[PDB]
């Protein structure tokens, strides 16, 4: 199978009155790509994609496409939806706008059963030739994918490759990789993401990328390359902040932070999301300050 | 002081056939809620696989359900909600332009607002129009709560919203609410504790049962509002086998399967992700409604 795996980083959509701020966008990704980062995801959920028009999911996958054209860093594009017949036309869009390939999350709110899951992303793989890669996370979706339906997927479609695990649970990372070792399992919850890599997971993506690039590729990197005492190292250096980035529903503290590190020029989000409370706020700010952010 | 929407009411399934909305079905369907004493509709709610519609036939169907229930005494409470507030405000405006007497807003899904968040969120969508809004609360398909206090203070501040709609089988928040603030319009939007929650104060339902036995679940409201709570209490344990069965998959999987078994819909046709239930969980389906006299048209 084609796949894209390594350190990721799910990017933030910076706002500037409203509108997206396409120059940050783009300064932001070469920052990225300057500190070893493997790949972006541009509109997913840390990039607040349920408040984006499709206008501007296009503008975003088209700037991530072209940023990193020519340095080898991937796009695995946001492309997902809890209607099938909406996720296949946004797998085909991000496609169409250079996407190396798509991550596709489970329908959130309809809560469909296993069949319904399989037959969702069968539909979505088979209207693609580039790699697919499923979405667990089902504190937000109220579903879950099981492993067994994660498998078969896997399995009986070329285009899907793994998944990205938001769950909390490493006994279901155990079970996918021992039951299915040719699998891409994803970490897709920064503070566990040395576990995740030392059971065989082939990647992160990340919301603590956003501010801390280099700290989440050294660390992707070392889990790789076996050097699991690096790696564990940078995890345990990385769990303050890794935690702060979540008191407050995502992306609300990151993109706080990425505007305290003066990374973003407004703090501006779309609602239902808005600023944090001021205690959170101060909270945020004082775990920033043990950390060595990179400028671009 | 406020314009409300209550007593029984039907959160509509949405026939389709052959790919399309089966609109003569829709209005055929309303129709005979109408006629068994549901006092408000629901189109295009989560029960009406709202996420799968287009645009087009959220406005068809919502149109359907206006025409329908003129001349009568039936209100029509539109499926209005999203979780970009800038998307449900819009959904808020046309509802109420498509002839809507009140709108059902969900708690944003997914994206998990903060407390915060969401009062500003349901402050924008009563502010753009002037008919009622009932928050719901879902916390099971949405990954967030509306708290009580949340609650309490859009229905203090926001002249059009009356009330919520809450489906998170907490008995306990049913009595934070409402002896905290006695004047809103607790709805329950979970079958099987209607009756608890009505005897408690609450003023209504928004039912999946009624879409197959309306006369049953309206008897049992109206029971309940005249304090009648023998009568009503008796109903609702008869009804608990069934609304639970109703449940054993996802609705409104079972809902459209029961309604297809009664012949009050042609084809048992989903969108997906949304699929026909297993062949267990079909027969079982099939063996509860035996339990249970089904109004034809
Ligand atoms: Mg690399
Ligand atoms: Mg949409
Ligand atoms: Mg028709
Ligand atoms: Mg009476």
Not at 76 to 105: C, M, P, Q, R, Y
Not at 147 to 155: A, G, S
């Amino acid at each position: 199978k084609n796949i894209i795996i390594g350190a990721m980083t799910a990017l933030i959509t910076p706002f500037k009155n409203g509108k997206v701020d396409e120059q940050s966008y783009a300064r932001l990704i070469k920052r990225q790509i300057e500190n070893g980062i493997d790949a972006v995801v541009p509109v997913g959920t840390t990039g607040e994609s349920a408040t984006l028009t499709w206008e501007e999911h296009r503008t975003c996958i088209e700037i991530a496409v072209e940023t990193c054209k020519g340095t080898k860093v991937k796009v695995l594009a946001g492309a997902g939806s809890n209607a099938t017949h909406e996720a296949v036309g946004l797998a085909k869009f991000a496609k169409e706008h250079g996407a190396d390939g798509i991550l596709s999350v489970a329908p959130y709110y309809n809560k469909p059963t296993q069949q319904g899951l399989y037959e969702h992303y069968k539909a979505i793989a088979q209207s693609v030739d580039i790699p697919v890669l499923l979405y667990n996370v089902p504190g937000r979706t109220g579903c879950e994918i099981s492993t067994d339906t994660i498998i078969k997927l896997f399995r009986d479609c070329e285009n899907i490759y793994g998944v990205k695990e938001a769950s909390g649970n490493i006994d279901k990372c155990v079970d996918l990789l021992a039951h299915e070792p040719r699998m891409m399992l994803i970490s897709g919850e920064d503070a566990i993401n040395y576990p995740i890599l030392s059971n065989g997971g082939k990647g992160v993506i990340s919301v603590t990328s956003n501010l801390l690039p280099d700290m989440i590729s050294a660390l992707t990197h070392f889990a790789l390359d076996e050097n699991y005492k690096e790696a564990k190292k940078i995890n345990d250096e990385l769990y303050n902040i890794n935690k702060i980035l979540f008191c407050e529903s995502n992306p609300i503290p990151i993109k706080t932070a990425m505007y305290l590190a003066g990374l973003i020029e407004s703090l501006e989000f779309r609602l239902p999301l808005c600023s944090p409370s001021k205690e959170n706020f101060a909270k945020i700010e004082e775990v920033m300050k043990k950390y060595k952010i990179k400028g671009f």
